[PDB]
Design a protein around this ligand. Structure first.
Ligand code: FES
Lengths: 112, 99, 120, 116, 146, 63, 148, 172, 64, 100, 39, 144
């Protein structure tokens, strides 16, 4: 019987020698977890010693954290280098808080 | 400039008094004005606005100065020696011999 | 077109090369070199080269190479006929003339298309 | 070791097989085709030696010309790969997953699949 | 409609369905569509780019636009009307049919988890201010560039 | 009229024993500014030949 | 009123174009038909050649021997001082005034412009910032406290 | 665009493909361009300090985006980390934060972009480019540090420390 | 002879990968220490197939 | 929500002294130069000889077909012939970087 | 005012190629206009 | 099971190699990340509920060689290795995500049918060394 519930075919193979655990879908649309994003952002913030990461409120202002453009754009560039992703000029100029930055990073599927 | 049609020489003198020393660029008009205006900006700091090319012409690399200025002394400020600690050429302050 | 005599000659040439290598070692025994920062760097007229492996050419002579291969094949084909031209016949002359005409027509067509010049 | 005819036939068949064994590169395919044509010419020479036939030996020049034509066509095709925006390694032109490639990974060229 | 006698005609602007689409030049463009029209039809009327639309909507009889989809339907005929819908729009759309999934799976270009056929997409009042993206669909045959 | 063209000196003196300013218009600088406009489309050997035929002395350009 | 005036001007321009078209003779009409027919069979190379001929490009090898005099030696016209006297010089972009708010985040952050304007109005003259050259221990002793 | 920062001045990933068989792309924001920078047009005249500040921020971001490649290519990553180099450059830029002339700011930005392109083209020696990226008040992380002054001049005021050293040679 | 203009020109179209310089540019430099560079010029010349495409002459190497 | 004459709903405009308002006015003026609709679609106009489907408007001439998409890159290239104030981070540039 | 005579953009060029020479020389011959050229 | 902690790289490596655990959960921690204490508590709690994987806790600060061997790009990290082969990783601190990953890893490991004799434990560096010998070594020899 042509079971419509079985959409599997030869083109649907999703086995790779790279990933030990087989991927969910053939399209490798795996977005980063908020936990991994937070860990990377914590490392990036630890790069700039002028801020205390222990009591970090992710929704606070960069200026309140102690960052101007010389630090805020520097932190954004460091995050971009770590994630190998380029923020569009509007996103870079409009990033207001670490929580918003984390949300934007999580949304991107090209992040790595 | 030299006019071959009239076979004469003309000299336009523009007086600059603004602190920025910014003037329009004739590079888009005369082709030779590119390198000329580049050298002029590199030597005297005359800012050719809307210029074809703002790249440096004769000044030394990694050197930010205007040697062709009334303030600049003959010896400058930076002199390059060979840093054995770096195994390459380094730059330090210029301590020159005076007459 | 070669034999075991040629093989032994190649072996003796390798022996002579080994002798040259010994001479080179003896000559290098009288020199002392101190390592420098750019001692083992690429020589690019006084500055560090901006590329290491990404040295790619445009390859504008591809048609020339293909035509050269074709002409080599044609010349190799023509060679056996001229190798024994002493016993040429009417059919042999006709075939040689046809081959020559074909080669000439091919060359003219290649020139007729301006394909013998480099392109951007 | 093996007799010459058997060695030549086995080598021709193994070369034909190995032409598919290696990865899918056009330049490698052209080189393998040239090697196969040379092996065919060698086999023809060996057969002409075995049977003492003039027509069998006459193949080498025709075989050489055919091989040259094929090599020129392959070179021209490979040159055209630059303008077609297709990589020389043909496996990178297909989205089907394969276990032979260590680093194959293709994703849609977009930023965010779900916008808000 | 339920329009009564003597009532004035309704402005088409009140029935304008807004679709914000990310075109292959990475451009945010706003298209307007009418209720009941296919996404492929709206794109063709608005001259949207990036959609090859090889099948031009596929078959005309027992098409996927009919509701409910008939069991004898042949499904899509090409793989060119590929549009990635937003999370709310794709969630409201539901699961693709068996033929839709079979056709979308056999696509040369990579597809996304929210990829649906524009010719198989129907205009619903729920799709107001809908977000879509149009990655460059593949080109198949020699007449595709004609 | 030097052999390379019109070599000019513009001297402005403020009355002192040293000129206030002394600019040098060397035709070699003009020849160097036009080589790219003349070098376009030429091969490497042709570029070398044009550099030879541009009659540019590096000392005149450098000043 | 502006829309009506623009419609009237467009109508005048269309009338001028049509009169340019409507006043053709028999020879002109035949030539136009032949041109349409040739365009129906002119390849992309033919269109490029027509454009090059309109641009004065060489039409033979002998002329191409000195082609650089035409394509390359022709210097570009200088720009306009009106273009030099411009109002804004930012890159062109679509006005995301009615677009979805998710797409509105990708537009230029005009709020930063107003904030910087307020800051600059408040800070017209600023004292020089002095970066101290006083010696201090490293903030990250890892360059001097690394074991492996 | 026909500029050094143009999108088309990117090295193709493959010898026959730009990025991949399904889409194109290249890296030029964080790496060098495909061809040399023939012309460097002057910055558009900004009549507002707000525009000047925006241009300065853009230049700082562009410099930061190439700090990794600049450090990696010059083999000068040992002197300071990429974040450390960014912090030092930010401090150096803050040193000139007192400027208030839009024309001077534009000229400085053009000169800095030219210098960065020269560094991107490796036309300048690494030992000289380290002057801008060196730490302001800390020892270089590529060499050991001696706290002889900090120990001997412990809690000593700046005037006393300067008096104890001597401003000129003690022999002549 | 016949027309060969197309074999000599190759302009770049907007976002056209085919019309772009589909080759790794050999950014070789006629640096100072070259027999034909006159010693005091670094002519960074973008050359494509031994044919110079772009020119950028680094001068001032002997500026005194 | 209630909608204006256009298909988009009514939205409050920016402040009078807003740089956003100034930029919107400038964007509309620049759009009039290349015959771009308020939605950014190359509109119609008087037909132009040798320009294909592209027509001629009142405040300028279009760069595409009627009711087409006005490419931002094309407008930027046309307006600034070679001026690159900065390597502007656009969506297309970010997509190219992500592809790389 | 009468319409000014057409002025070609290809015209006013320092040199004329074969096509431009044919366009300008319509109605005459090369020897008729510029005289006979000798070798 | 229970979390077994080791502050010596050699000791931890020997302990891991001796047991030949089918599933190994390595909790690598560093004092740089302020959220490591919560990660340590989560690892201790989850060590009991899932005895299928052996839980080994290493502090990167006290064991610098561990970071090099495990290629830990950031801390805290939870590396799930199957028979010595790297199966999955958790870069952040998330109890729910860690539990889901552990369940998925257990299911995937159970679902495999390893051929007899080829189901032996291997060192974590074996895969990297083989990959270098197969791909990196040839490229390095061809280049330099
Ligand atoms: S028209 Fe073919 S996929 Fe829809």
């Amino acid at each position: 019987f042509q079971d419509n519930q079985d959409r599997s075919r030869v083109e649907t193979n999703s086995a790779t020698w790279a990933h030990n655990l087989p991927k969910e879908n053939k399209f490798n649309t795996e977005t980063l977890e908020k936990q991994e994003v937070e860990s990377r952002i914590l490392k990036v913030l630890s790069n700039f010693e002028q801020v205390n990461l222990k009591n970090l409120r992710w929704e606070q202002n960069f200026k309140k954290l102690g960052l101007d453009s010389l630090d805020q754009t520097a932190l954004l560039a460091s995050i971009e280098h770590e994630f190998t992703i380029l923020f569009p000029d509007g996103v870079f100029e409009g990033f207001e808080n670490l929580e918003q930055v984390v949300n934007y990073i999580l949304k991107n599927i090209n992040a790595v | 400039y030299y006019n071959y049609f009239l076979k004469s020489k003309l000299t336009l003198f523009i007086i600059l008094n603004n602190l920025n020393k910014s003037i329009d660029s004739i590079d888009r008009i005369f082709a030779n004005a590119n390198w000329l205006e580049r050298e002029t900006s590199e030597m005297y700091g005359i800012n050719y606005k809307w210029k074809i090319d703002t790249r440096k012409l004769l000044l030394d690399y990694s050197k930010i100065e205007n040697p062709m200025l009334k303030e600049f002394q003959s010896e400058g400020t930076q002199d390059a020696f060979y840093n054995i600690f770096e195994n390459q050429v380094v730059v330090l302050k210029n301590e020159t011999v005076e007459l | 077109m070669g034999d075991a005599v040629v093989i032994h000659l190649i072996q003796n040439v390798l022996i002579f090369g080994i002798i040259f290598w010994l001479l080179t070692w003896g000559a290098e025994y009288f020199y002392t070199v101190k390592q420098q920062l750019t001692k083992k760097q690429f020589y690019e007229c006084g500055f560090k080269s901006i590329s290491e492996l990404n040295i790619q050419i445009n390859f504008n002579f591809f048609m020339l190479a293909v035509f050269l291969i074709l002409y080599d094949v044609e010349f190799t084909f023509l060679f056996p006929v001229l190798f024994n031209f002493s016993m040429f016949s009417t059919t042999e002359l006709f075939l040689a003339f046809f081959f020559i005409f074909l080669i000439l027509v091919s060359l003219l067509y290649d020139w007729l298309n301006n394909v013998l010049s480099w392109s951007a | 070791m093996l007799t010459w005819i058997s060695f030549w036939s086995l080598i021709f068949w193994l070369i034909l097989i190995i032409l598919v064994l290696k990865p899918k590169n056009f330049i490698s395919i052209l080189f393998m085709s040239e090697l196969t044509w040379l092996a065919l010419y060698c086999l023809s020479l060996l057969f002409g030696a075995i049977y003492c036939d003039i027509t069998l030996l006459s193949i080498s020049f025709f075989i050489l010309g055919v091989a040259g034509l094929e090599f020129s066509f392959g070179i021209l095709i490979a040159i055209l790969y630059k303008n077609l925006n297709e990589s020389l390694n043909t496996d990178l032109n297909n989205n089907n997953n394969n276990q032979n490639i260590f680093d194959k990974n293709f994703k849609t060229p977009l930023e965010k699949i779900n916008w808000q | 409609h339920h329009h009564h006698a003597g009532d004035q005609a309704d402005r088409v602007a009140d029935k304008i369905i807004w679709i914000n689409i990310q075109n292959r030049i990475g451009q945010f463009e706003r298209i307007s569509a009418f209720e009941g029209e296919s996404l492929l039809e709206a794109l063709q009327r608005n001259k949207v780019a990036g959609i090859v639309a090889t099948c031009e909507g596929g078959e005309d009889i027992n098409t996927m636009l009919e509701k409910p989809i008939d069991p004898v339907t042949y499904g899509p005929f090409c793989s060119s009307c590929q549009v990635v819908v937003s999370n709310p729009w794709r969630n409201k759309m539901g699961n693709l049919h068996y033929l839709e999934e079979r056709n979308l799976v056999r696509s040369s270009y990579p597809t996304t988890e929210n990829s649906r056929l524009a010719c198989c997409i129907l205009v619903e009042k729920w799709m107001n201010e809908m977000i879509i993206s149009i990655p460059q669909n593949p080109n198949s045959v020699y007449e595709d560039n004609m | 009229e030097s052999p390379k063209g019109e070599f000019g000196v513009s001297m402005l003196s403020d009355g002192s024993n040293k000129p206030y300013k002394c600019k040098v218009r060397s035709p070699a600088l003009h020849h160097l500014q036009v080589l790219p406009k003349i070098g376009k489309g030429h091969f490497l050997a042709d570029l070398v030949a044009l550099v030879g035929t541009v009659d540019i002395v590096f000392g005149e350009i450098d000043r | 009123r502006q829309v009506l005036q623009e419609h009237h001007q467009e109508c005048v321009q269309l009338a001028r174009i049509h009169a340019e078209e409507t006043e053709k003779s028999f020879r002109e009409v035949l030539n136009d038909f032949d041109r349409i027919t040739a365009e129906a069979e002119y390849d992309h190379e033919s269109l490029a050649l027509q454009k090059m001929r309109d641009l004065g490009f060489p039409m033979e090898g002998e002329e191409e021997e000195y082609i650089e005099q035409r394509v390359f030696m022709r210097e570009q016209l200088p720009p306009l001082e009106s273009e030099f006297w411009k109002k804004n010089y930012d890159p062109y972009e679509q006005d995301l005034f009615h677009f979805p708010d998710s797409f509105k985040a990708y537009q230029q952050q005009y709020k930063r412009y107003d904030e910087a304007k307020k800051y600059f109005e408040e800070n017209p003259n600023v004292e020089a910032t002095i970066i101290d050259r006083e010696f201090k221990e490293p903030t990250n002793k890892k360059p001097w406290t690394r074991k492996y | 665009m026909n500029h050094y920062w143009g999108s088309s001045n990117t090295i193709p990933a493959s010898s026959t493909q730009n990025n991949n068989y399904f889409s194109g792309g290249g890296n030029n924001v964080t790496i060098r361009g495909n061809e040399i920078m023939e012309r460097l047009p002057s910055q558009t005249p900004s009549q507002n300090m707000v525009q000047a500040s925006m241009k300065t921020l853009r230049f700082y971001r562009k410099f930061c985006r190439l700090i990794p490649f600049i450090l990696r290519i010059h083999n000068i990553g040992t002197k300071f980390t990429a974040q450390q180099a960014m912090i030092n450059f930010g401090n150096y830029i803050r040193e000139r934060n007192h400027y208030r002339d839009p024309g001077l700011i534009d000229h400085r930005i053009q000169l800095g972009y030219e210098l960065l392109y020269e560094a991107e083209m490796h036309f300048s020696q690494h030992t000289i480019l380290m002057q801008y990226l060196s730490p302001y008040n800390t020892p270089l992380s590529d060499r050991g540090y001696s706290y002889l002054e900090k120990v001997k001049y412990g809690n000593k005021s700046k005037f006393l420390q300067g008096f104890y050293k001597g401003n000129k040679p003690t022999e002549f | 002879m016949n027309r060969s203009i197309f074999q000599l020109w190759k302009p770049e179209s907007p976002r056209s990968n085919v019309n772009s310089k589909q080759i790794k540019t050999m950014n070789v430099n006629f640096g100072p220490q070259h027999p034909a560079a006159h010693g005091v010029l670094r002519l960074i010349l973008q050359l494509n197939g031994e044919i110079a495409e772009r020119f950028d002459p680094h001068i001032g190497l002997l500026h005194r | 929500r209630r909608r204006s004459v256009d298909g988009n709903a009514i939205r409050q405009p920016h402040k009078v002294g807003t740089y956003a308002a100034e930029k919107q006015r400038l964007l509309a003026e620049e759009r009039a130069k290349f015959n771009v609709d308020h939605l950014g679609r190359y509109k119609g106009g008087l037909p132009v000889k040798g320009k294909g489907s592209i027509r001629k408007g009142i405040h300028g001439e279009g760069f595409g077909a009627p009711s087409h998409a006005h490419d931002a890159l094309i407008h930027q290239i046309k307006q600034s012939k070679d001026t690159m104030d900065y390597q502007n981070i656009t969506n297309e540039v970010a997509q190219n970087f992500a592809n790389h | 005012s009468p319409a000014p005579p057409t002025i070609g953009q290809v015209e006013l060029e320092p040199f004329k190629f074969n096509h431009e020479r044919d366009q300008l020389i319509y109605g005459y011959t090369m020897e008729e206009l510029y005289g006979k050229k000798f070798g | 099971s229970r979390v077994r902690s080791f502050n010596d790289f050699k000791a931890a490596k020997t302990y891991i190699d001796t047991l030949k655990p089918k599933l190994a959960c390595l909790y690598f921690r560093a004092d740089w990340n302020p959220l490591c204490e919560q990660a340590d508590k989560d690892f201790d709690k989850l060590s009991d509920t899932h005895l299928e994987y052996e839980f080994v806790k290493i502090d990167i600060d006290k064991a610098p060689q561990a970071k090099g061997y495990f290629a830990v790009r950031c801390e805290p990290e939870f590396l799930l290795l199957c028979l010595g082969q790297e199966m999955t990783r958790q870069t952040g601190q998330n109890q729910r995500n860690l539990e889901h990953r552990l369940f998925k890893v257990q299911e995937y490991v159970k679902g495999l049918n390893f051929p007899a004799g080829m189901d032996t434990y291997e060192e974590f560096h074996e895969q990297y060394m083989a990959e270098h010998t197969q791909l990196d070594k040839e490229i390095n020899e061809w280049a330099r």
